[PDB]
Design a protein around this ligand. Structure first.
Ligand SMILES: Nc1ncnc2[nH]cnc12
Ligand SMILES: Nc1ncnc2[nH]cnc12
Lengths: 226, 226
């Protein structure tokens, strides 16, 4: 089993990279992929690009060149569900584009031609991730994650998202693009995001902590799936 | 020299695929790439998917696997300029995302982190495409093309694009994603789009005519470049 890891938190990627044994660095399309073993398990690690296309570019290179069995995609996200708190860890049951609209042709909002309305995370990965999170004494919340090429900052942006996806619990900029590429490559995936802020509610205190714990979560999830 | 060709119109890809000599077909990540020689010139042909991520996925595979020296990206788009008419052929001098927004952090509208505000098509490739179109007795219009994961059918969506991009003359769904991937791979490209309809003014009927013209244009450009 080979596990692909795509992380958006630089510190998490560094922490994991430094732990890889027999580390090899592959440079393609302006991306760097680290391969080797993490506690005996073969892995392929990549720092996530920003936005749908850059994230898709890196994921495509990794999936094609390393051909992993599964993808674990980590990062941070803004919370949409009111019951969330900074530090919570959301686990995707599915991912949708909040900025895709071809409804004029009968497609469901957010759905793109040739794709399902939402991209489903693998049941086994979801369960394993949720178990690894609880073991670290952290709080995991399962649900719909939406993404788009926009940094949601104001009320209007949030309103549109909550209106189109009242069930969405988190939002960011790369999750659905990675799920989409994984879907097209028929590779199981799970998206996990530490909640950095909540829509209607310290930097280091969050990022320093989230990145470290996410890396431990990944290490634990890799061994579990192994 | 090796020329990469990515076209949106199914019929154009078929016409060009049928002309490739010593044709080989490569199946990667759900995509099909045809390689061989077009009138003696090494080419790599691929039909673009729908949307930024699908388009980026295919482009990434072609650029990495085939290492083309240049990219010719064809298709169709909706006209934004009032002087444009169905049938005109827009040649991009630049490509921008009309649905990317990180202005909260000083980015120009449509610009994403890690990228320039817009992606510039190659000066030499632009001029060459313009010459080929003129030689075919067709009308080429040079300008900004914007892309996003949505079909624009007038209304508020159209007004928003005209407001944010006064200079944009055409709009579709893949151009900028492909330009973006080429940019990251540092490969010269040129975007060309036949105008299928104009804002405020049959798709298949248009396609039956434009797809054929576009294929001849591509063939001519390949030779002109070789
Ligand atoms: N509020 C937000 N909108 C988009 N991407 C984000 N990434 C983290 N927070 C985000
Ligand atoms: N008006 C339009 N908006 C988005 N994609 C298009 N593709 C062709 N015409 C289009």
């Amino acid at each position: 089993m080979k596990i692909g890891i795509i992380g958006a938190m630089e510190e998490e990627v560094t922490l994991l990279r430094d732990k890889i044994e027999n580390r090899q660095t592959i440079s393609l399309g302006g991306c760097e992929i680290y391969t080797g073993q993490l506690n005996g398990t073969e892995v392929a690690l990549l720092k996530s690009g920003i936005g749908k296309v850059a994230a898709a570019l890196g994921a495509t290179l990794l999936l094609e060149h390393c051909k992993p069995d599964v993808i674990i995609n980590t990062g941070s996200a803004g919370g949409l569900a009111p019951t969330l708190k900074v530090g919570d860890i959301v686990v995707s049951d599915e991912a949708r584009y909040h900025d895709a609209d071809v409804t004029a042709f009968g497609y469901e909002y957010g759905q793109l031609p040739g794709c399902p309305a939402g991209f489903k995370a693998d049941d086994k990965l979801i369960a394993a991730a949720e178990a690894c999170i609880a073991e670290l004494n952290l709080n995991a919340v399962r649900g719909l994650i939406v993404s788009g090429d926009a940094f949601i900052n104001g009320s209007v942006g949030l309103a549109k998202i909550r209106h189109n996806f009242p069930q969405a619990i988190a939002v960011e900029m790369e999750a659905t693009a990675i799920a989409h590429v994984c879907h097209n490559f028929n590779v199981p995936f799970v998206v996990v995001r530490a909640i950095s802020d909540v829509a209607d509610q310290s930097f280091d205190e969050f990022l320093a902590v989230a990145a470290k714990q996410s890396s431990l979560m990944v290490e634990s999830l890799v061994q579990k799936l192994a």
